[PDB]
Amino acid sequence: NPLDLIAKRAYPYETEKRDKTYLALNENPFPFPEDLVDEVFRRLNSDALRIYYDSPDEELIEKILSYLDTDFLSKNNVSVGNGADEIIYVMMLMFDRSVFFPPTYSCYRIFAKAVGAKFLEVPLTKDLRIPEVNVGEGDVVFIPNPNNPTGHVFEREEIERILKTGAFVALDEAYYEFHGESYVDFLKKYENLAVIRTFSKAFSLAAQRVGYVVASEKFIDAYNRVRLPFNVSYVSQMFAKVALDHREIFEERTKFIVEERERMKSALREMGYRITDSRGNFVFVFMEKEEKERLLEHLRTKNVAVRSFREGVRITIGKREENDMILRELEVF
Amino acid sequence: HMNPLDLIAKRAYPYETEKRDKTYLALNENPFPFPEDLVDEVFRRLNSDALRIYYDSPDEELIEKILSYLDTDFLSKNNVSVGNGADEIIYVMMLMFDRSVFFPPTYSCYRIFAKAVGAKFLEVPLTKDLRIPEVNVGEGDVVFIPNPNNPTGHVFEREEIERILKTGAFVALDEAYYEFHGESYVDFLKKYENLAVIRTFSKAFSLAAQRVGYVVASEKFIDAYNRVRLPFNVSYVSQMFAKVALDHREIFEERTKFIVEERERMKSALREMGYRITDSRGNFVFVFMEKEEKERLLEHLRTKNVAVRSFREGVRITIGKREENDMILRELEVF
Numbered sequence: 001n002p003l004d005l006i007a008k009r010a011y012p013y014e015t016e017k018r019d020k021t022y023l024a025l026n027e028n029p030f031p032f033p034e035d036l037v038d039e040v041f042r043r044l045n046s047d048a049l050r051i052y053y054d055s056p057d058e059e060l061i062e063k064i065l066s067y068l069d070t071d072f073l074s075k076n077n078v079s080v081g082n083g084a085d086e087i088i089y090v091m092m093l094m095f096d097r098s099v100f101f102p103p104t105y106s107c108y109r110i111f112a113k114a115v116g117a118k119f120l121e122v123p124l125t126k127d128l129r130i131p132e133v134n135v136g137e138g139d140v141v142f143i144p145n146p147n148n149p150t151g152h153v154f155e156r157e158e159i160e161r162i163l164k165t166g167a168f169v170a171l172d173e174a175y176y177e178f179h180g181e182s183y184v185d186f187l188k189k190y191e192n193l194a195v196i197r198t199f200s201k202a203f204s205l206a207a208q209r210v211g212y213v214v215a216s217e218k219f220i221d222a223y224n225r226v227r228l229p230f231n232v233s234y235v236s237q238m239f240a241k242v243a244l245d246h247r248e249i250f251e252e253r254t255k256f257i258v259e260e261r262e263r264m265k266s267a268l269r270e271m272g273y274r275i276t277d278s279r280g281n282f283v284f285v286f287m288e289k290e291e292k293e294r295l296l297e298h299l300r301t302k303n304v305a306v307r308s309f310r311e312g313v314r315i316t317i318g319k320r321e322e323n324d325m326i327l328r329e330l331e332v333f
Numbered sequence: 334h335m336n337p338l339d340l341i342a343k344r345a346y347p348y349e350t351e352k353r354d355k356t357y358l359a360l361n362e363n364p365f366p367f368p369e370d371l372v373d374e375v376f377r378r379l380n381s382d383a384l385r386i387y388y389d390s391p392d393e394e395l396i397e398k399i400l401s402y403l404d405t406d407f408l409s410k411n412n413v414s415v416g417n418g419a420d421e422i423i424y425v426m427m428l429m430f431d432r433s434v435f436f437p438p439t440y441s442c443y444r445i446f447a448k449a450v451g452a453k454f455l456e457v458p459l460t461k462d463l464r465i466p467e468v469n470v471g472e473g474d475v476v477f478i479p480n481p482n483n484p485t486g487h488v489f490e491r492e493e494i495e496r497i498l499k500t501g502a503f504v505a506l507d508e509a510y511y512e513f514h515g516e517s518y519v520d521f522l523k524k525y526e527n528l529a530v531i532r533t534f535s536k537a538f539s540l541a542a543q544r545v546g547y548v549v550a551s552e553k554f555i556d557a558y559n560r561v562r563l564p565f566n567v568s569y570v571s572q573m574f575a576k577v578a579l580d581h582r583e584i585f586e587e588r589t590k591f592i593v594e595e596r597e598r599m600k601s602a603l604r605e606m607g608y609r610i611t612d613s614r615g616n617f618v619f620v621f622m623e624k625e626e627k628e629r630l631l632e633h634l635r636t637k638n639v640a641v642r643s644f645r646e647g648v649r650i651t652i653g654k655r656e657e658n659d660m661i662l663r664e665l666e667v668f
């Protein structure tokens with residue numbers, strides 16, 4: 001009964017009914033602009049819906065390349081996924097062993113167990129530094145940068161130290177847009193690196209699932225052989241193309257989210273909370289289990305959702321009134 | 334002495350995109366565009382605030398509408414899930430079981446995906462009469478059986494499938510072409526825990542570019558499947574397309590009726606010409622041809638900007654519009 005083994009081995013699947021003020025999945029506070037939804041639909045060919053539509057199409061790759069804005073990338077350095085999740089998932093199917101460093105993205109462990117990958121979890125140090133680990137060729141090492149859930153940034157030397165082991169580094173730059181530095185340039189020097197990106201956070205397209213990966217031609221070829229061939233829909237691609245053609249609105253939204261993040265980080269410091277230097281669309285607050293659970297319960301009654309972790313809570317940046325409500329809840333507590 | 338990227342390149346087939354000829358009859362696609370009225374309905378129902386969230390996949394409404402379409406008394410929400418195409422459902426099932434079993438001539442992606450993900454698999458060819466062969470299978474195996482079969486379009490008897498179910502092996506019944514045949518083996522789930530039926534919106538609803546498949550099975554299996562698959566695997570808008578299609582099935586019913594009549598008309602004409610064909614019940618016909626005579630037909634078709642699908646024993650020709658079908662028959666008549 002293989003299905004019993006999956007009950008034992010893999011984590012259960014659950015749908016959770018969202019609270020009124022939901023600040024728990026690092027989603028953008030803003031709806032996708034209505035004008036751009038309109039543009040999407042006046043670009044749609046109903047005759048195109050009936051066919052197996054190339055994933056990615058050429059135009060989406062040209063626009064992603066234009067967004068990346070390098071001198072050295074070509075179309076063979078870029079592919080797409082059904083979310084960044086798919087890219088991670090597929091990478092776990094590709095290598096002998098997956099390595100990651102708690103506190104990290106919760107789906108690494110989940111997907112490893114889901115697909116029965118060999119994996120090694122070694123915790124980040126007390127200072128949130130990457131630990132000493134025995135890794136090499138055959139391994140893929142998943143490093144989110146900025147880190148999730150801490151939002152902190154690993155120094156370049158840290159990433160490079162792993163790169164010099166020969167292990168394959170999967171640099172998950174899901175929160176790149178809120179930080180503004182990318183290690184994509186390291187592809188000039190290292191063949192053993194892939195940078196993973198998404199439209200979900202900064203472009204308000206989490207429901208449409210478009211991720212992309214930037215890597216060497218050898219890797220991208222291999223990835224494209226292992227993934228599903230028609231993995232991103234015609235309309236998801238069109239949403240991503242239209243978003244890339246109108247970046248100014250998204251830049252203004254990002255600017256608001258970062259200013260709102262830093263304002264919250266300052267207020268929390270002034271209150272005496274121990275926080276991380278987060279560079280994502282969220283803040284991380286350290287708290288003790290007992291302080292945490294009392295706060296959580298209070299938020300529960302006020303119809304607010306944040307994300308609980310072992311060492312504290314991760315609060316996504318929302319709208320000005322939501323952010324102020326959070327600060328007020330933390331002040332009393 | 335080989336880095337993992339070289340191993341993949343060795344074992345897995347290359348990624349290759351196709352160039353579409355002016356008359357393309359090679360991927361079992363619906364001839365008709367998705368209705369314009371329904372595209373506008375999707376745009377109308379679309380909530381731009383929903384676009385920014387990790388949207389449930391499947392949402393509750395999509396499930397309700399799939400159940401209503403299936404129209405049984407005994408299925409609940411716990412018996413149904415979704416995939417990013419039926420392709421994803423197959424792919425995940427291959428990750429779920431110890432061994433994958435299929436029977437050539439069969440769906441080309443089974444072998445491809447097995448090799449892609451490094452699944453252990455067993456390929457045993459169908460008999461001369463297109464019957465499922467004697468095979469040593471049991472618990473731990475998943476046996477992929479398309480019904481109607483792809484590329485032959487022929488229908489397996491219930492007894493053939495029930496024999497496999499009784500082994501204890503898990504049967505994945507791929508009902509991608511159900512709509513063009515009209516009988517389903519979903520009622521077997523009253524009795525067998527041991528079974529999943531896979532379905533798609535791609536062929537009958539002209540939504541191949543939006544990738545919505547669904548699977549119907551026991552609660553135990555669906556739970557397991559939902560643990561192994563990507564949690565947000567089908568997009569908000571893909572789900573809205575599928576929901577709107579299910580709210581307006583009469584147009585799709587008339588299209589399916591046209592496709593089946595068109596298929597049977599072609600099957601008759603080909604028999605009258607002296608071609609050996611299968612009794613196809615999909616949106617396509619399968620014509621047996623000797624290798625060398627088949628290649629000659631292909632050059633003619635290539636010369637005339639027509640794509641069909643070439644197989645070891647013949648060609649699988651998807652039903653298109655009346656004018657493309659008529660043209661196929663001319664070229665098979667003159668040939």
Ligand SMILES: Cc1ncc(COP(=O)(O)O)c(CN)c1O
Nearest residue numbers: 083084085105144148174198200
């Ligand atoms: C670190 C990290 N990586 C990947 C993802 C996935 O994003 P996507 O919506 O594009 O699958 C997320 C968000 N769940 C993330 O936080």
Ligand SMILES: Cc1ncc(COP(=O)(O)O)c(CN)c1O
Nearest residue numbers: 418419420440479483509533535
């Ligand atoms: C037998 C079979 N099964 C599954 C599929 C997949 O359908 P989908 O387009 O929804 O991935 C196809 C079509 N590619 C098929 O022919």
